[PDB]
Design a protein around this ligand. Structure first.
Ligand SMILES: CNC(=O)N1C[C@@H](C)Oc2cc(C)ccc21
Length: 116
């Protein structure tokens, strides 16, 4: 149990999010919210109940809307789980998601220990 300052969470967690942005082109389909009408995928919101993307996570850090570090981690995992759920395992976006998940898994473990 701990009260976290939003600036403390930003300085600690934003580097792990930037490590995902730096993956090019793997991060490109994750940088903005999925737009099913534009992309022609009307079943997306049938499958994905709670969408999440990098720009939404970044804004929540910038505005202090995470109270605790595990809320940030849950949003990153939600973004990954949505992409693995909707896209087929042979697809470009599914393989992109696995690469981003590999990067995040290596970045987030010591950061979470330092925060407590
Ligand atoms: C995590 N992204 C994602 O699931 N999608 C759905 C997939 C069918 O293709 C996409 C293409 C573009 C340009 C942006 C997002 C996506």
């Amino acid at each position: 149990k701990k009260i976290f300052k939003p600036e403390e969470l930003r300085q600690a967690l934003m580097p792990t999010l930037e490590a995902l942005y730096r993956q090019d082109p793997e991060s490109l389909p994750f940088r903005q919210p999925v737009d099913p009408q534009l992309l022609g995928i009307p079943d997306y919101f049938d499958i994905v109940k709670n969408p999440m993307d990098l720009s939404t996570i970044k804004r929540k850090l910038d505005t202090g809307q995470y109270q605790e570090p595990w809320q940030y981690v849950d949003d990153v995992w939600l973004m990954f789980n949505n992409a693995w759920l909707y896209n087929r395992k042979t697809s470009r976006v599914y393989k992109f998601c696995s690469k981003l998940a590999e990067v995040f898994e290596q970045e987030i473990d010591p950061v979470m220990q330092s925060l407590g």
